[PDB]
Amino acid sequence: QFSSLRTPTGDISGQNKNNLISGKATGRVGNYITVAVEYQQLEEAIKLNQLEE
Amino acid sequence: QFSSLRTPTGDISGQNKNNLISGKATGRVGNYITVAVEYQQLEEAIKLNQLEE
């Protein structure tokens, strides 16, 4: 973005110009999202029908 | 229904996983619905005409 100067004759020698100042926006990685489950071999053998569903 | 852990590296070693817990809905039988009639053979012969109406 720039500003301007308002002068009767338009000589700017006694003054200061626009600088050029960069800026930036940073994207980052977040935390993981994790759903975890565990079950005993016994449970799968006798309890676990339809585990898919 | 499940829930989730939030880790910076994905390291879940020391924590609580989901538990599997099963519910069920049940339904039963009610009473009968019964309508019952009777009538004499003589009534059928000389009286009940349009029985199906």
Name the minimum distance, in Å, from the CA of B28 to any CA of chain A. 24
Q: Determination technique for this PDB entry?
A: cryo-EM
Nearest residue in A to B5, CA atom: A34
Determine which helix (DSSP H) or strand (DSSP E) holds B42, and give its type and residue range: helix B41-46
Task: Give B26-30 contacts, CB < 8 A, sequence gap 24+.
Answer: none
Give the one of B7, B9, B18 whose C-beta lies nearest to A37's C-beta: B18
> Tokens 């829930």 map to which residue?
B3
Note whether A16 and A23 are within 8 A (CB): no
Note whether B30 and A50 are within 8 A (CB): no
Nearest residue in B to A35, CA atom: B4
Bridge pairing between strands B5-7 and A32-34: antiparallel
Q: What is the resolution of this structure in A?
A: 2.9
CA-only gyration radius of chain B, Å: 34
